[PDB]
Amino acid sequence: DLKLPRQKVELVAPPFVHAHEQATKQGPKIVEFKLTIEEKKVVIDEKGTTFQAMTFNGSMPGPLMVVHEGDYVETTLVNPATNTMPHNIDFHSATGALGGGALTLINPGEQVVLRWKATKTGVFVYHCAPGGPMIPWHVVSGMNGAVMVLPRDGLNDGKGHALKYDKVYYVGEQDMYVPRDEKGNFKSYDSPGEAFTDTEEMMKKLIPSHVVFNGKVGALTGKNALTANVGENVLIVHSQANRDSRPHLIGGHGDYVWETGKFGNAPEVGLETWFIRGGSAGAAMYKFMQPGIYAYVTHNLIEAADLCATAHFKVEGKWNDDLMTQVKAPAEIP
Amino acid sequence: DLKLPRQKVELVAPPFVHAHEQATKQGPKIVEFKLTIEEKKVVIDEKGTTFQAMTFNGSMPGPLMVVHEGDYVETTLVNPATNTMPHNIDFHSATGALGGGALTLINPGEQVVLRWKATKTGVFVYHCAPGGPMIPWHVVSGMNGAVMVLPRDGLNDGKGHALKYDKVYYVGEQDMYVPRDEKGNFKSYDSPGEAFTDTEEMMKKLIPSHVVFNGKVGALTGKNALTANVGENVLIVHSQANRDSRPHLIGGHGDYVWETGKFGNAPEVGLETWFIRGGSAGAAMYKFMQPGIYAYVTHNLIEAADLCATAHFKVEGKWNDDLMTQVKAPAEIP
Amino acid sequence: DLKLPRQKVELVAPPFVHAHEQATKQGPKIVEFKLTIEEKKVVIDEKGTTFQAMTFNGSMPGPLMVVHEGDYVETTLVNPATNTMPHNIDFHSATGALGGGALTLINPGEQVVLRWKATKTGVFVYHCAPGGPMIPWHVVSGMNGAVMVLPRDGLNDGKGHALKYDKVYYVGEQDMYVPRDEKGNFKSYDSPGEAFTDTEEMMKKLIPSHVVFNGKVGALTGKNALTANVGENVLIVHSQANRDSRPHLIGGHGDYVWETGKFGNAPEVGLETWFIRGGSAGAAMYKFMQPGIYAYVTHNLIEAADLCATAHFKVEGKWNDDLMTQVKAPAEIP
Ligand SMILES: OC[C@H]1O[C@@](CO)(O[C@H]2O[C@H](CO)[C@@H](O)[C@H](O)[C@H]2O)[C@@H](O)[C@@H]1O
Ligand SMILES: OC[C@H]1O[C@@](CO)(O[C@H]2O[C@H](CO)[C@@H](O)[C@H](O)[C@H]2O)[C@@H](O)[C@@H]1O
Ligand SMILES: OC[C@H]1O[C@@](CO)(O[C@H]2O[C@H](CO)[C@@H](O)[C@H](O)[C@H]2O)[C@@H](O)[C@@H]1O
Ligand SMILES: O=N[O-]
Ligand SMILES: O=N[O-]
Ligand SMILES: O=N[O-]
Ligand SMILES: O=N[O-]
Ligand SMILES: O=N[O-]
Ligand SMILES: O=N[O-]
Ligand SMILES: [Cu+2]
Ligand SMILES: [Cu+2]
Ligand SMILES: [Cu+2]
Ligand SMILES: [Cu+2]
Ligand SMILES: [Cu+2]
Ligand SMILES: [Cu+2]
């Protein structure tokens, strides 16, 4: 009975985001997405530690879905027969039926189609939630992503001025719980099922072994560093489906920050470090002023440097000596 | 010398709240409350784990006290001779004498009467605080509740519009520290005193064994689920006297949220998950749009599903297919 | 080429703050500071536990630096030959080069001079960040402080009214990780280098042994209690470079709070407890209304009472019985 135009989106793997308009003259449409669940053993660190991951579309985090307020989001969720467990999807952006979870439980070999109306603006978590103790387990195994619901007029600063980003990145942070054997090495498992008992015991102690961006230590460094140029306004969407995080751009700021992630609220300005509550997404925009390398971290520095939670930006452009200068290089003390 | 009318309140056990007006034409009064401390061994989980609780009025949390700005709150605190320890009360809503703690220390067999002027609006924690290492121990043993100080004109959205709730619930979250014996079973103790040494050792490691609403795993489920109807605006007051929490209504939102809990500040709008700082209360209101079961959790999902921190709402009314619909039920993949 | 007047500041040890103007008619200047790194073994608790500290200017936290928006901050960082490690400095208030860290790495026997323009108002962390796993280690060893960048018109409430403080204190909170030996006693080490392996292993488990203000349990109690008088407006700057905190003034409030610490945002009003995200500074002002002793804590009460995180205020003036009174002193129950 819903007679609106249909638009398909081709999702892209994080940290990139599929093409979209900020402000739009389009009216509501039914925006069609497909997510295909993949359970797979992956490597999560430079030492070769393995992990029984469970993913939407093969990635941790799942891809960012972008729509506008008043759109209808129609998702085909697919659980191929090559998987071992039931799965579903809960959208924090949606209203009713446990976010959609109560309507989307699918066994291996099945698919389901859910539609929800995007009545709330902001960035929001989505995650699997099959029931009971499976809920945390599927989430901390990687089954979480985000969806961004933009105002049709684009973003604003709460004082009448438009805020337009030149690019957007999606940083999904994942707390992981990898058990150790008696001598202190990380364990490997043959299936998610086999990993479950030891993983749950560790989970209940509330200390992760790894905290990573984009699924692996170092994922967003080297060839895969984030990039910008001086003068570019970059939006960084950050999600954490289970545990708090405190993002910080080393050498920069959050010029405009929605730490609770919801665009009906004005952004805060000029932040050093912001806070993503476990179970949410937030967003920060920054206009780069200086070239060079920046690190984007959670500012629990133990997590950042020792447990995996560091990304880099490589920024091109001209150095601004008015903003910062080395007046005297390192020299022997007089 | 204070010549105002006196009004007695009959407190009720959480999650319910004693009857009160939102907006009022009454001027200030002296509002009289009684709290009677009870130390008691209770069951906190479905496996029969026991716990040496210490409570105001027999409940965890202690009952919600509701007054208006400019009222005077006169509390008779009673420590019956059947208890073993000294106790007191600190109101975060009050000014002076460590919140009242320095004026209310009572041995078993004694009572005291404290009056404080409600000069600050919002929801606030109250808790026992007898001195030194006893302070955390009495709090994490259950000796905490909340008090709500309403504006005399009721709540507003910060943009001129009244916000009236149809009902209010009080969810008190309790971090508990139950030691285990060598083979890994929870220990039982004959008295709070006997539980103290092992409990303190565990407390200092900062990981709870249980995180519960209303004193027990499953307290706010089944016959004791929270309830609403589609179209009802429900206020949920959430407190945590010792440790952070991140509330989330699964399948809903926080339409208007005071996460720091203080009504002199405008609410934020349209939240997915909010944050209650340890040592505070916050409040969220939501107008239900869909029938069915909702879960109200802390969105550390390990705490929610595995350590006890899940409540349910059962909501009656008509399903709204515009907001959400299952377009295609689970089916075999083509 | 920068032709502005130069002004030297004599830094003072926390919790005190060097003399400065709130509102000023001065235009921009180059404000000159010196920080001299000291590695030293210190006592951190009343039991005599020792700790391999690394400090700016000999203190934990490092001293508060105060300037105005648009000033240039020129810091001479000195690493004497008596130290063992390289060190640097990252200012969260600065733009570029990892906050200055990429321009300030100095070996023992060297110094460097960095200048940055104070373009962002608020309170901000500064900390050492030499690279890799050294970053958390130097920070949690004590190498962090703060800088306050005031508006030239002083502070305001966001509604047109000036907020002038009568005094300001700087409370730096430090999470410390002191390993234990087999029988459960804290270990002592002969050098920071020797402490590193055991300290890193503990750090990665994310539970501190101590959480202190001003470098030691009890530092801000007794002779060294903070002080005020009834009617005095006190600003409390609170920093935490690595881990979250939840400040609370027991018996008081946060009348005006910048919990994210940034003066381009209006303060929140009337808070009980606020939240300092790890990697940030925040600020709260309170006008004292009652004499007596107050405690200033993190409201994880286990951390406050058992791990070290309690300061006192001693406040002089006249008791206000309208705000609070003991109606009936402790007496036997009728
Ligand atoms: O060497 C036997 C001795 O080792 C312990 C660990 O201290 O257990 C190890 O050996 C057992 C027998 O091979 C294994 O099953 C166990 O998993 C391993 O830790 C003791 O329990 C045992 O007495
Ligand atoms: O079987 C004795 C042996 O067991 C240990 C634990 O490994 O201690 C247990 O037995 C002691 C004597 O009964 C108890 O006091 C103790 O509480 C219990 O754990 C060893 O310490 C002991 O050598
Ligand atoms: O008494 C020897 C016995 O003690 C253990 C600890 O259970 O190790 C202790 O003694 C070793 C030899 O002196 C020390 O190196 C070690 O540091 C200390 O804990 C056992 O490993 C050993 O069998
Ligand atoms: O070696 N097993 O944990
Ligand atoms: O290189 N020393 O001045
Ligand atoms: O068995 N005692 O912990
Ligand atoms: O039931 N299978 O389409
Ligand atoms: O006794 N060494 O940890
Ligand atoms: O001192 N008893 O009332
Ligand atoms: Cu799943
Ligand atoms: Cu969720
Ligand atoms: Cu008590
Ligand atoms: Cu308190
Ligand atoms: Cu250093
Ligand atoms: Cu930093």
Short mmCIF file of C-alpha atoms in Angstrom, two decimals, chain B:
data_model
loop_
_atom_site.label_atom_id
_atom_site.label_comp_id
_atom_site.label_asym_id
_atom_site.label_seq_id
_atom_site.Cartn_x
_atom_site.Cartn_y
_atom_site.Cartn_z
CA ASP B 1 10.33 28.91 63.65
CA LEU B 2 9.47 27.59 60.17
CA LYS B 3 5.66 28.19 59.90
CA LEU B 4 4.59 26.34 56.73
CA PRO B 5 1.87 23.67 56.27
CA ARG B 6 2.94 20.06 56.86
CA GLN B 7 2.13 17.22 54.43
CA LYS B 8 2.84 13.56 55.08
CA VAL B 9 3.78 11.22 52.22
CA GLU B 10 3.21 7.47 52.24
CA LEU B 11 6.19 6.08 50.33
CA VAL B 12 5.73 3.18 47.96
CA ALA B 13 8.17 0.52 46.89
CA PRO B 14 9.96 0.93 43.55
CA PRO B 15 9.48 0.86 40.65
CA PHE B 16 6.27 2.67 41.53
CA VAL B 17 6.24 6.25 42.81
CA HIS B 18 4.01 7.83 45.43
CA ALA B 19 1.19 10.03 44.19
CA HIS B 20 2.17 13.62 43.47
CA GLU B 21 1.31 16.65 41.34
CA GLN B 22 3.50 17.75 38.43
CA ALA B 23 2.51 21.41 38.17
CA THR B 24 1.07 22.69 41.46
CA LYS B 25 -0.67 25.78 42.81
CA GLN B 26 0.47 24.88 46.31
CA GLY B 27 3.16 27.02 47.80
CA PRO B 28 6.03 25.58 49.83
CA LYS B 29 5.32 23.08 52.52
CA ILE B 30 7.19 20.87 54.88
CA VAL B 31 6.91 17.42 53.33
CA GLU B 32 7.36 14.62 55.87
CA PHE B 33 8.95 11.27 55.01
CA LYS B 34 10.01 8.27 57.10
CA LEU B 35 12.74 5.83 56.15
CA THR B 36 13.38 2.71 58.25
CA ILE B 37 16.67 0.91 57.62
CA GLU B 38 16.60 -2.84 57.17
CA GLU B 39 19.65 -5.11 56.97
CA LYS B 40 18.61 -8.44 55.49
CA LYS B 41 19.83 -11.44 53.53
CA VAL B 42 18.12 -11.59 50.16
CA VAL B 43 18.15 -13.68 46.97
CA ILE B 44 19.47 -11.77 43.96
CA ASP B 45 19.33 -14.26 41.07
CA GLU B 46 17.34 -17.16 39.65
CA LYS B 47 20.04 -19.64 40.80
CA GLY B 48 19.40 -18.72 44.43
CA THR B 49 22.54 -16.66 45.10
CA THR B 50 22.21 -14.81 48.43
CA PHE B 51 23.40 -11.35 49.35
CA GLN B 52 23.81 -9.37 52.57
CA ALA B 53 21.68 -6.34 51.72
CA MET B 54 21.35 -3.08 53.60
CA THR B 55 18.29 -1.03 52.62
CA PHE B 56 16.17 2.01 53.18
CA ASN B 57 12.55 0.83 53.75
CA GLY B 58 13.34 -2.79 52.81
CA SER B 59 13.87 -2.25 49.06
CA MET B 60 16.69 -1.85 46.57
CA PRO B 61 16.63 0.94 45.49
CA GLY B 62 15.15 2.88 48.36
CA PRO B 63 11.84 4.56 47.44
CA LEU B 64 11.61 7.67 45.25
CA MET B 65 10.72 10.78 47.23
CA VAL B 66 8.93 13.50 45.16
CA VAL B 67 8.67 17.19 46.15
CA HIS B 68 8.65 20.60 44.48
CA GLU B 69 11.26 23.35 44.32
CA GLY B 70 11.20 25.39 47.53
CA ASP B 71 9.60 22.67 49.66
CA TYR B 72 11.32 21.62 52.84
CA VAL B 73 11.91 17.87 53.12
CA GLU B 74 11.75 16.56 56.66
CA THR B 75 12.93 12.96 56.95
CA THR B 76 12.74 10.77 60.02
CA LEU B 77 15.49 8.20 59.61
CA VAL B 78 15.05 5.13 61.84
CA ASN B 79 17.72 2.51 62.57
CA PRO B 80 15.95 -0.27 64.55
CA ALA B 81 17.76 -2.22 67.24
CA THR B 82 17.45 -5.35 65.07
CA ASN B 83 20.19 -3.91 62.79
CA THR B 84 23.93 -4.36 63.54
CA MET B 85 25.57 -1.25 62.10
CA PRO B 86 25.39 2.53 62.29
CA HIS B 87 23.83 4.23 59.28
CA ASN B 88 23.06 7.75 58.03
CA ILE B 89 21.74 9.55 54.95
CA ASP B 90 23.31 11.90 52.37
CA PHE B 91 20.92 13.66 49.97
CA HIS B 92 22.61 14.95 46.78
CA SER B 93 19.67 17.37 46.53
CA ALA B 94 20.61 19.04 49.85
CA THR B 95 23.10 21.79 50.79
CA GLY B 96 25.46 21.40 53.73
CA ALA B 97 26.77 18.84 56.22
CA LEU B 98 27.84 16.29 53.62
CA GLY B 99 24.30 16.21 52.24
CA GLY B 100 22.93 15.55 55.71
CA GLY B 101 25.31 12.67 56.47
CA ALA B 102 27.14 14.66 59.15
CA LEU B 103 23.82 15.23 60.99
CA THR B 104 22.20 11.79 60.66
CA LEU B 105 24.56 9.14 62.01
CA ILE B 106 22.42 6.78 64.11
CA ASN B 107 23.28 3.62 65.97
CA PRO B 108 20.86 0.66 66.12
CA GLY B 109 18.04 1.71 68.40
CA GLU B 110 18.10 5.39 67.36
CA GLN B 111 16.36 7.77 65.01
CA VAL B 112 17.06 11.29 63.78
CA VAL B 113 15.09 14.02 61.99
CA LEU B 114 16.73 16.09 59.23
CA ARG B 115 15.16 18.90 57.26
CA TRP B 116 16.58 20.34 54.03
CA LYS B 117 15.28 22.94 51.59
CA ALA B 118 14.81 21.70 48.02
CA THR B 119 16.61 24.54 46.22
CA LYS B 120 17.80 22.48 43.21
CA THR B 121 15.44 20.85 40.68
CA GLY B 122 15.98 17.42 39.14
CA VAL B 123 16.38 13.85 40.17
CA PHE B 124 19.10 13.20 42.74
CA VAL B 125 20.66 10.22 44.51
CA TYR B 126 20.40 9.69 48.24
CA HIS B 127 22.59 7.13 49.97
CA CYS B 128 24.11 6.03 53.26
CA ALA B 129 27.65 7.26 53.95
CA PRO B 130 28.80 6.37 57.48
CA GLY B 131 32.48 7.23 56.99
CA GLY B 132 35.63 5.93 55.38
CA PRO B 133 35.57 2.48 53.75
CA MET B 134 32.05 1.98 55.07
CA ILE B 135 30.79 4.50 52.53
CA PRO B 136 31.17 2.35 49.36
CA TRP B 137 30.29 -0.80 51.28
CA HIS B 138 26.91 0.49 52.51
CA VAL B 139 26.10 1.92 49.05
CA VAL B 140 26.93 -1.22 47.10
CA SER B 141 25.06 -3.25 49.73
CA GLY B 142 21.89 -1.48 48.58
CA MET B 143 21.67 1.70 50.67
CA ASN B 144 20.74 4.16 47.97
CA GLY B 145 17.62 5.65 46.39
CA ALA B 146 16.54 8.90 44.76
CA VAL B 147 14.54 12.09 45.24
CA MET B 148 12.82 14.09 42.50
CA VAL B 149 12.45 17.86 42.91
CA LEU B 150 9.97 19.15 40.35
CA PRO B 151 9.56 22.75 39.17
CA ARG B 152 6.26 24.11 40.50
CA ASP B 153 5.15 24.62 36.90
CA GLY B 154 5.99 21.03 36.01
CA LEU B 155 8.48 19.91 33.35
CA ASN B 156 9.18 21.75 30.07
CA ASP B 157 11.14 21.11 26.88
CA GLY B 158 13.28 24.24 27.01
CA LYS B 159 11.38 25.78 24.10
CA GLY B 160 8.28 26.94 25.98
CA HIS B 161 6.23 23.69 25.85
CA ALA B 162 5.04 21.73 28.83
CA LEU B 163 6.04 18.10 29.12
CA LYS B 164 3.52 16.14 31.16
CA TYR B 165 4.02 12.45 31.92
CA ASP B 166 1.15 9.99 32.22
CA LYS B 167 3.16 7.81 34.54
CA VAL B 168 6.58 7.62 36.12
CA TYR B 169 8.70 4.63 37.05
CA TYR B 170 11.88 4.54 39.12
CA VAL B 171 14.56 2.09 38.01
CA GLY B 172 17.39 1.82 40.51
CA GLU B 173 20.44 0.00 39.20
CA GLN B 174 22.69 -1.78 41.71
CA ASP B 175 26.21 -3.06 41.15
CA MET B 176 26.80 -5.99 43.52
CA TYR B 177 29.99 -7.68 44.58
CA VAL B 178 29.47 -11.30 45.61
CA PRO B 179 32.69 -13.25 46.24
CA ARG B 180 33.27 -16.79 44.99
CA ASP B 181 34.90 -19.73 46.78
CA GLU B 182 37.78 -21.78 45.32
CA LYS B 183 35.63 -24.00 43.06
CA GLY B 184 33.84 -20.93 41.75
CA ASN B 185 30.51 -20.85 43.61
CA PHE B 186 29.13 -17.68 45.11
CA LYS B 187 29.65 -17.48 48.85
CA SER B 188 26.96 -17.00 51.46
CA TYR B 189 27.44 -15.17 54.73
CA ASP B 190 25.68 -15.08 58.11
CA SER B 191 25.86 -11.31 58.60
CA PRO B 192 26.93 -8.17 56.74
CA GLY B 193 29.92 -8.00 59.10
CA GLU B 194 31.03 -11.49 58.06
CA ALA B 195 30.65 -10.59 54.36
CA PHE B 196 32.75 -7.42 54.72
CA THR B 197 36.36 -8.65 54.35
CA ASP B 198 35.75 -10.78 51.20
CA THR B 199 33.35 -8.25 49.75
CA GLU B 200 35.82 -5.33 50.15
CA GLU B 201 38.62 -7.27 48.48
CA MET B 202 36.34 -7.88 45.50
CA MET B 203 35.00 -4.32 45.47
CA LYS B 204 38.49 -2.88 45.11
CA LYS B 205 38.92 -4.86 41.88
CA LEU B 206 36.01 -2.78 40.37
CA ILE B 207 34.16 -5.63 38.57
CA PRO B 208 30.66 -6.46 39.85
CA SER B 209 29.31 -10.02 39.90
CA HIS B 210 25.77 -8.80 39.30
CA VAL B 211 24.20 -5.60 37.95
CA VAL B 212 20.46 -5.56 38.68
CA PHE B 213 17.37 -3.40 38.51
CA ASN B 214 15.09 -3.27 41.55
CA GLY B 215 17.36 -5.55 43.57
CA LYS B 216 17.26 -8.86 41.64
CA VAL B 217 17.82 -10.43 38.25
CA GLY B 218 14.43 -10.43 36.53
CA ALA B 219 12.79 -8.15 39.10
CA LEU B 220 11.07 -6.05 36.42
CA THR B 221 9.99 -8.93 34.13
CA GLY B 222 6.93 -11.29 33.98
CA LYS B 223 4.12 -10.34 36.39
CA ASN B 224 6.31 -7.40 37.39
CA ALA B 225 7.02 -6.01 33.91
CA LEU B 226 6.58 -2.28 33.54
CA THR B 227 3.48 -1.40 31.50
CA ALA B 228 2.16 1.25 29.17
CA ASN B 229 -0.24 1.85 26.35
CA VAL B 230 0.35 3.31 22.92
CA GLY B 231 0.00 7.08 23.25
CA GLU B 232 1.20 7.19 26.90
CA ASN B 233 4.11 9.42 27.88
CA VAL B 234 6.22 7.57 30.42
CA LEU B 235 8.98 9.13 32.56
CA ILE B 236 11.75 6.69 33.54
CA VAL B 237 13.97 7.87 36.40
CA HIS B 238 17.22 5.91 36.51
CA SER B 239 19.77 6.07 39.33
CA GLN B 240 23.18 4.56 39.93
CA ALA B 241 24.89 5.61 43.17
CA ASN B 242 28.35 4.11 42.49
CA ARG B 243 28.97 3.15 38.85
CA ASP B 244 28.10 4.40 35.36
CA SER B 245 25.15 3.05 33.37
CA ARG B 246 23.94 3.55 29.77
CA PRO B 247 20.15 3.15 29.59
CA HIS B 248 18.41 2.18 26.41
CA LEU B 249 14.78 1.31 25.59
CA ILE B 250 14.96 -1.48 22.97
CA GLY B 251 12.46 -0.64 20.24
CA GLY B 252 12.00 2.89 21.53
CA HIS B 253 13.94 6.11 22.19
CA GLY B 254 14.43 8.81 24.74
CA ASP B 255 12.14 11.50 23.34
CA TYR B 256 13.27 14.00 26.04
CA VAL B 257 16.29 13.11 28.18
CA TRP B 258 17.95 14.81 31.12
CA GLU B 259 20.93 12.52 31.32
CA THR B 260 22.61 14.56 34.07
CA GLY B 261 19.16 14.64 35.65
CA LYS B 262 18.69 18.36 36.34
CA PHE B 263 15.63 20.26 35.20
CA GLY B 264 17.28 23.69 35.05
CA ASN B 265 18.83 22.33 31.83
CA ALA B 266 16.76 21.68 28.69
CA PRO B 267 16.34 18.00 27.79
CA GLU B 268 18.09 16.51 24.84
CA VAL B 269 15.83 15.02 22.17
CA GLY B 270 15.58 11.76 20.27
CA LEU B 271 18.28 9.73 21.99
CA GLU B 272 19.01 6.03 21.41
CA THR B 273 21.10 5.49 24.58
CA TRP B 274 21.87 7.90 27.40
CA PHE B 275 24.41 7.94 30.22
CA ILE B 276 23.91 7.96 33.97
CA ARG B 277 27.12 8.93 35.71
CA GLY B 278 27.88 6.91 38.79
CA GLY B 279 26.64 8.99 41.70
CA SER B 280 23.64 10.44 39.92
CA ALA B 281 20.14 10.06 38.68
CA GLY B 282 18.81 10.93 35.25
CA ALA B 283 15.42 10.87 33.60
CA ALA B 284 14.00 10.08 30.18
CA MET B 285 10.51 10.39 28.81
CA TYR B 286 9.09 8.45 25.89
CA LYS B 287 5.68 8.40 24.22
CA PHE B 288 4.96 4.83 23.17
CA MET B 289 4.03 4.40 19.51
CA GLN B 290 3.94 0.62 19.13
CA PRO B 291 2.48 -2.22 21.23
CA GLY B 292 4.43 -5.26 22.29
CA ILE B 293 7.33 -6.10 24.53
CA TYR B 294 10.24 -3.74 24.98
CA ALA B 295 13.37 -4.33 26.99
CA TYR B 296 14.93 -1.55 29.05
CA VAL B 297 18.62 -2.26 29.55
CA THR B 298 22.00 -0.87 30.28
CA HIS B 299 23.61 -1.09 26.86
CA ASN B 300 26.65 -2.87 28.06
CA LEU B 301 24.88 -5.95 26.73
CA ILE B 302 27.06 -8.28 28.78
CA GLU B 303 25.76 -6.58 31.91
CA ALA B 304 22.22 -6.55 30.53
CA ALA B 305 21.91 -10.16 29.41
CA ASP B 306 24.51 -11.96 31.55
CA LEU B 307 24.79 -9.96 34.83
CA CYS B 308 21.14 -9.03 35.42
CA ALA B 309 20.42 -5.54 34.05
CA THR B 310 17.24 -6.02 31.97
CA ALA B 311 13.66 -4.86 32.60
CA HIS B 312 10.65 -5.39 30.33
CA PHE B 313 7.77 -3.17 29.30
CA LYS B 314 4.52 -4.73 28.09
CA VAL B 315 2.67 -2.21 25.91
CA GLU B 316 -0.93 -2.49 24.74
CA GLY B 317 -2.44 -0.88 21.67
CA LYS B 318 -2.58 -1.05 17.88
CA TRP B 319 0.40 -1.87 15.69
CA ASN B 320 1.48 0.90 13.32
CA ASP B 321 2.54 -0.59 9.99
CA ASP B 322 3.69 2.82 8.68
CA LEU B 323 6.38 2.93 11.36
CA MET B 324 7.51 -0.68 10.91
CA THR B 325 6.42 -3.73 8.95
CA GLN B 326 7.65 -7.16 8.10
CA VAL B 327 7.43 -6.94 4.31
CA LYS B 328 8.38 -10.61 3.80
CA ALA B 329 8.41 -13.13 6.63
CA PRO B 330 11.41 -15.50 6.96
CA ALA B 331 11.62 -17.69 3.87
CA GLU B 332 14.17 -19.91 2.10
CA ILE B 333 16.70 -17.94 0.05
CA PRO B 334 15.86 -18.00 -3.67
#
